Each structure stands twice: as C-alpha cells, then as structure tokens.
Write a protein that binds this ligand. Structure first.
Ligand SMILES: COC(=O)[C@H]1[C@@H](OP(=O)(O)c2ccccc2)C[C@@H]2CC[C@H]1N2C
Lengths: 216, 219
C-alpha cells in the first residue's frame, strides 16, 4: 500500500507567522484526469479530523484562506499563513488514488506563546472517599507555558515519590497554555498518619517553586 | 445539513465480534458517496477500514482480510461495521464519514466512538468532589474539581453544570492502573460566584450506564 511519511516540526511557531507542513508519498498521486488526489486534515485537541484541503490544493467549504496547498506528484506542502492559536493540533495528509486510502503519520503544530506561571491548587481527600478507605490528594497546575514542569510532593515536610500519578493536557486551542494534574493516592490510615500535605511546582517562570498546602 | 453519529458497545471480548452503527440524518445513504469507517488507534495513527456506496458497492482495507463487513439498512438510513475475531490490536476510536469521489469529506465526520478489546469487566467510576481546604485571596478566581476514580473501560464524559459551563474547564487524560482508569477535571470560576452559585460536575460512563452528579460544597 502507499506509504505517506511526515516529518515533525523542530519547534513551536510564533502566532502570525507562516508555517509549512510536509508530506511525501511512495507513489504518484497524480491521476489520469490531471488532478492530484491528496487531502490535508487538521485534528484539533479532542476533536474529530476536519478536512482542510482536497485535490492537493482545493480548499474545503468554510476553510480559512490562510490555508493553501501545493506540491508535485509525490511531495506536498500545506502552508498556513498568519498561524493562529486555534490551528494547533495534528495535521495529516491522506491519499485517494489506491486502496487502502492511507493517511500520513501526522505532524503536530504547537504555538510558542509568552511564558506563563501555573496557577496551582491543592485539594484534600473527600469525606466520601475517606469512608471508602482511600485518600487521594489532588494538585492542579493550570494554564502555564512552556510545557516543561516539575511537581514535588511533601508530607509533614518530607518528600514523597510513591503513589503519585501525573497527567498532562495538550496545548489549549484558545490561550495556547498547558495544564497538569498530580494525584497522590494513599490508604485512609496512611493519610490519617500525617497533618501537612504540600504540592510544589517548579517552572521556568521563577526561581522559587510555587507551593500550595493544607493541614488535615 | 448532514450529520453522522456512531454508536455501539465500547467493550468487546477478544475473539468476539465488534459491531458499530452509524446513523445518518439530513442525507440519504442510498447515494453515490463512500459511507466509510475509519479508526484511530491509541497513538493517533489513522486507518481507512472501508466503505459502502450506492447501496451495493463495498470496498475494504485488504489488511482486514475477510473479518470486516460493511452493510446498511435503507429504512433506518444507517450503515454498519462488523469486525470479527477482534484482538487488543483493534482497540481504537471508530469514526464514520462521508467521502465523495474527489476525496472531500467536508465536515461530515461523526464524533467517534471508543471500542476497547479486553477481557476485563466493566466497572463504573466513583466520583469525588474536590473543594478547597481553606480560604484564599477572594475577589478573584477559585478552582474546584472532581476526581473520577476506578472505571473501565474508557471513556467517561465530564461536564460542569450540565455543560452550560465549559469555559475554564480542564478535564485531564485518564491514567491506567490495575485495569482501572482514574481522571480529574478542574473548573475555575469567579470567586464571587462560589459557593453562592452552585457548581456541579456531571460524570457519565456509557459502558456501565451510570451517571453521577456531584455538587461541590465548601468544607
Ligand atoms: C482506487 O480507486 C480510486 O482511488 C478511485 C476513486 O475511489 P472510488 O472509485 O473507490 C470512489 C470513492 C468515493 C466516491 C466515489 C468513488 C477516488 C478517486 C477518483 C478515481 C480514483 N481516485 C483517484
């Protein structure tokens, strides 16, 4: 089957600038009718794929004129003029000349916005979970940039590394920021054996970690 | 206009058969369009599975061999996907879409439905409220949340105030552990509106037919 390869972007791009995304096919997509059957799709965070371009250079209905496509028979390029926060996600090209109609590996687009420190919030276990014998302490590190970040848990002033699970969101389509949740899970008895619970966020935006805590 | 919607079991045991339905509204499927099924594996790789067109024309991905079948019911304006002898390799999000001769699908894609191939049993989540411990600088913003713990399979649908509040919401990707998923969702609102204005997280788990509404109250 036809194999379509795509290379990753080397860095996040600046809003307003022009960006080019490439796609390469192992076989020509030029059909006997002189048309080249290559589609470009954008899959925004948490959404279904949306067609941007078809027939290599034809814009789909309602697609912004900031998107244009060019290329030869095996090398294609999607050009995005004046890139916007809403353009983040993964771009995929697809061929429509031979079964199966394969998709490329996809290219992620990130926006490099101004540095932003995270808004940190910590939450004690709920009375409901406690009656269940469990105790989860949750910490949210919201709306920061860049994406690199480190969270440290402390219990009664002592560092903790066991029972912690983190999750990161993709880049926000509206404000180009990132968010993370850190959850420390312990048995009820363990939780009842300490008083101070602290979440410590270290970001590039500052020398000192942002600290949030509570006393049981 | 045209709208497509997928539906079917989100959990299928290995070796058994997967079945999905795409209900089309606003356009007849007896038309000359490729009513197709596409799937996206964990990792985001996309794959064309095949299509049914003009009622009697079907085309399938050769790699699926003879285990895939695509059929339709004109009276209900629905087309179906049947994938036999599934393995964990078939775990993915399945989408239906309308493709025309020139490869154009417009915005005619369904929202997709997740199917997980596993021997594990369906387990409903327990939903816990996340309310601040003490008080902070008011007159600004306050963050609340909900912890959705111990469910299987994915996904869970989390909304705040019935979905009437969607701005400033962060629902994090679930983490898997011991065949169970756990996820959290945060919501940030003007401190002047909480706890005066109620804030509730709604958590639905389709696979287990459960739904929990948890109001966040001060502690
Ligand atoms: C392998 O065949 C192709 O690539 C064909 C076609 O696929 P199809 O005949 O299966 C079809 C799809 C959707 C709607 C009508 C017809 C798509 C375009 C047009 C001709 C040819 N391809 C370049």
């Amino acid at each position: 089957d036809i194999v379509i390869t795509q290379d990753e972007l080397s860095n996040p791009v600046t809003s307003g600038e022009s960006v080019s995304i490439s796609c390469r096919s192992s076989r020509s997509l030029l059909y006997k009718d002189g048309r080249t059957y290559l589609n470009w799709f954008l899959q925004r965070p948490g959404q279904s794929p949306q067609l941007l371009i078809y027939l290599m250079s034809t814009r789909a209905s309602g697609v912004s004129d900031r998107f244009s496509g060019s290329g030869s028979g095996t090398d294609f390029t999607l050009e995005i003029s004046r890139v916007k926060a809403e353009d983040v996600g993964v771009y995929y090209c697809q061929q429509f000349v031979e079964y199966p109609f394969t998709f490329g590996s996809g290219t992620k687009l990130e926006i490099k916005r101004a540095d932003a420190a995270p808004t940190v919030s910590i939450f004690p276990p709920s009375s409901e979970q406690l009656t269940s014998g469990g105790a989860s302490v949750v910490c949210f590190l919201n709306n920061f940039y860049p994406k690199d970040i480190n969270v440290k848990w402390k219990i009664d002033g002592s560092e903790r590394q066991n029972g912690v699970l983190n999750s990161w969101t993709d880049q926000d389509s509206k404000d180009s920021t990132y968010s993370m949740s850190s959850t420390l899970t312990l048995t009820k008895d363990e939780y009842e054996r300490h008083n101070s619970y602290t979440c410590e966020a270290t970001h590039k935006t500052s020398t000192s970690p942002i600290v949030k805590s509570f006393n049981r | 206009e045209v709208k497509l919607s997928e539906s079917g079991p989100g959990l299928v045991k290995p070796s058994q058969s997967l079945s999905l339905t795409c209900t089309v509204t606003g356009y007849s499927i007896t038309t000359n369009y490729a009513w197709t099924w596409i799937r996206q594996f964990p990792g985001n790789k996309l794959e064309w599975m095949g299509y049914i067109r003009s009622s009697v024309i079907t085309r399938y991905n050769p790699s699926l061999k003879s285990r895939i079948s695509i059929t339709q019911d004109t009276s209900k304006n629905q087309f179906f996907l049947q994938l036999n002898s599934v393995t964990t390799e078939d775990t993915a999000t399945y989408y239906c879409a309308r493709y025309d001769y020139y490869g154009n699908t417009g915005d005619y894609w369904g929202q997709g439905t997740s199917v997980t191939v596993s021997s594990a049993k369906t387990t409903p989540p327990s939903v816990y409220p996340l309310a601040p411990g003490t008080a902070a600088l008011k007159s600004s913003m306050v963050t609340l949340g909900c912890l959705v713990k111990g469910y299987f399979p994915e996904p869970v649908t989390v909304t705040w105030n019935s979905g009437s509040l969607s701005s400033g919401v962060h629902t994090f990707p679930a983490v898997l552990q011991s065949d169970l998923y756990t996820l959290t969702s945060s919501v940030t609102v003007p401190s002047s509106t909480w706890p005066s204005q109620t804030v509730t997280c709604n958590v639905a788990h389709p696979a287990s037919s459960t739904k929990v509404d948890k109001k966040i109250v001060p502690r």
